[PDB]
Symmetry: D2
Amino acid sequence: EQVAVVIGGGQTLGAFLCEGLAQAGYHVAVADLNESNANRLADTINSRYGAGRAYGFKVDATDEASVEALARAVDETFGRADLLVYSAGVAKAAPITQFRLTDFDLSLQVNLVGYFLCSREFSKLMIRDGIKGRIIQINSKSGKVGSKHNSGYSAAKFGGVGLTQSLALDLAEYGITVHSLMLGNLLKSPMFQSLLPQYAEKLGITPEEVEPYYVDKVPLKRGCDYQDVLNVLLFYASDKAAYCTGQSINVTGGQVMF
Amino acid sequence: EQVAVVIGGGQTLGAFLCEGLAQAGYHVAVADLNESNANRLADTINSRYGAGRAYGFKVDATDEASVEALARAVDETFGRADLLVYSAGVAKAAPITQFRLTDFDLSLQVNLVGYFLCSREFSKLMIRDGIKGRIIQINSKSGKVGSKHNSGYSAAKFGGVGLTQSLALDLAEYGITVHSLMLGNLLKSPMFQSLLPQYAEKLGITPEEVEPYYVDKVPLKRGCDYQDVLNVLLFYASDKAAYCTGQSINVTGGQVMF
Amino acid sequence: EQVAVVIGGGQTLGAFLCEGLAQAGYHVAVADLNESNANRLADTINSRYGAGRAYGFKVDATDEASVEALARAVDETFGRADLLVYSAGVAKAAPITQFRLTDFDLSLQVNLVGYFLCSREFSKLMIRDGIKGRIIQINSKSGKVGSKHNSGYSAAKFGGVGLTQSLALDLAEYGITVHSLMLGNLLKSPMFQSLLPQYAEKLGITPEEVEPYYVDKVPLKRGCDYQDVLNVLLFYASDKAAYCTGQSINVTGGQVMF
Amino acid sequence: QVAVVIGGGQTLGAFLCEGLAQAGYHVAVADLNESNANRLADTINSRYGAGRAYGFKVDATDEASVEALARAVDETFGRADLLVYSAGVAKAAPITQFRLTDFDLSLQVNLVGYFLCSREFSKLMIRDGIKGRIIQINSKSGKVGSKHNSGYSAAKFGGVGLTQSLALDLAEYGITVHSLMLGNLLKSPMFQSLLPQYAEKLGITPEEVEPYYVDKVPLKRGCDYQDVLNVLLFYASDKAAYCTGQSINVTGGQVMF
Ligand SMILES: [Cl-]
Ligand SMILES: [Cl-]
Ligand SMILES: [Cl-]
Ligand SMILES: [Cl-]
């Protein structure tokens, strides 16, 4: 009977996790800024796995009223919340010298303030109902090791780790655990694929040589795929990981061991 | 059809893990300094899971001849080796001023040299058969933070981490992943129970208040259970954690979040 | 002939670092929200060290126009900049379920965006003039370990570590190094001294029990003092620490060793 | 103030002995090669004069030897203020070919010797009420596991663990303890001799080994003996009294955790 709320649910990784959770037997609130994508995914889940397994919702995670309204809506639809997945954030690269304040502010709003607001709202619902819940943030190796030309992304992602640990400490007395998943490069993803040019120029190499460059830094000699993320998420979300909380869990093929 | 070799399988945590592995489907090589405890545990698994599921072996993991003979005995018994679990080590508490060399040396032998020997012999078997195998070390929060009056235990357990990371780097090309599990206090274990009077003094409090003193340091407000151990182990040993290697996985109720 | 700019130089710790830097032989730009505080401390410094040693400047580090003007003002005044010290931001406590967005937001502006603006604008000066400069941020043990009831503060202080590492990588090619200093508790701060009541309440004990309570957490059995900060600051700002960059330097009396 | 340097009779260790004396320390220069320790202390004695440095023999892996060094320094100098532990050399092999004797040796030299020398010299500090300093020379391989160097990594990570436990045990006596996590000392004789192996370890020509490692480092150079000496002096000083139990990176930004 568990309910999963996925912020950033309407596309790519977030959308897969939504389908993955549904396949695992959760009911899913697909929540996105693009309501049309949210509802289109919810219908696809329902076509694939049965009636009423998902519902689509609009939220701007950066806005307090919007977050409050989503939580009200989710409660009205499903009556409980068990698992919050927060998926958001896109790195915009520039040397510190030329990094815009608007971009830095955006990174902070989308990766930190939205994470805060969604966590605060859904933990309240978990507490109300005596639910030993789970909060899982999608994060990055960039939240473990500073990324050259990506100060806004690293600052925001490091910050995510700090928030995950404060939330874990605040929420432990209610049986809610909180983690951040520190993902390696989703090399075949549409986002990674579209930046192969930009990487080529930062690294001084050809677009076609970028994926081998990054593969070669991974001990297991391959990039991360969405199923790697889902599988880790599933375990940490489950009752079997009840004694783990506040962690930065690496999913990096061994590239990060700290 | 996988085989798990559990070094330290004859008693307490290690026995619990052998049984749990068998519950999960594994054939189990119960390996132990006490061959009699090992053979008896194997008998118990066989009556519960069917003939030939488990066999007992003698090993002294500090002795190279003994470990090489264990790996040959496992190979002759089962087709193969898929998971190595290394479970050994008990802390001895003394201020550095009084710490004996013999005990420091023994902490290294048992916690580190044995881990190295077992990893070495069993990895050659995995490599021989092209098995995408698993090596899992039982370690401690004292391998994440040095522990007062436990210099020997901390040196050895931090050591185990370094070994894990090196082994992960050496074997990744063969699809073998390597992890350390950084356990909290196993408050219910017979060892922990026996030491209540010694910790009572060392702290400056009664025996009865020890468990609550250590429980209070934990955000989740309980001790580590054998089941928590087995849960985490089974995940990292599974094909669902194929993109994780070289890690220090905390199982601490949020006491350790770095 | 080096010039130090200290943001938040007009009182308490910032004021102590300004004096300490003048003593070490620096020209000091005292930058603060309170311009009269900035000017008077600079007068004190010139009354001891000679006219034109120190100048006071107004800055709102959270405002881009105010930071960009500060940089123009310092350049007009001293003609160069060698060391940026960013010393800003305070702790506001409340469990996540009552923690306000305004405060979370303010924490990010003061602790993080100010640090990004100041680093941006003074790095450009350092680059222009070919200076192998230093950027040092005042951070907290709360940027190493998440703080119960202090989500806004931990998020922002961890985010500072991330910004420090990305800065370091962006600026390495120019011989500029960047560090974050992870301070323990400044128990004899006015700040800390005035908050004894709240910690008393939060923890459940008389205000007279509060300093003892935090002391006993430190292995060195001492609170952090301003001179420890200065000491470490001076070393990492020196040409002796040229091969160190991107570091989170603990100044914690052994409370934090990771 | 007296400094004891283990492994002081050669290379980085020698460098450190010359630097501490220049910085104003009385040096007890201690090595397995007693001939080296004796003449480095006279190399030192022909610059800073006489009675400065003294050469002692020690097999840091041997309890008797280490305890005899501790009684001898107390006779020679009357006190101990700083212990520098400088030993250990990496032997490379894939785990599958790694010899036990080599693993055992790495632990004895890198970890057991550090334990023994910290134990003995810390007693001498406690006796004379000294708020002293124990500093270990370690490596980035004590921060991140090194491929084909299981022995060296296990040992060097071990040393961090020991550093932290020591710090916690010795804090009530005002003694601080740290490990220095060094980058590659590219010009050292050791590094220079092993370029062919590193070259065949990585599938490069020898001459292209150093630039392959320099390119890894955000500051774009190797670690220098002087970077080591600079950090040691700071953490060895009373200015660093509030720092203990740390792993201090000296890696040009290659390691930031
Ligand atoms: Cl945990
Ligand atoms: Cl990983
Ligand atoms: Cl560094
Ligand atoms: Cl510290």
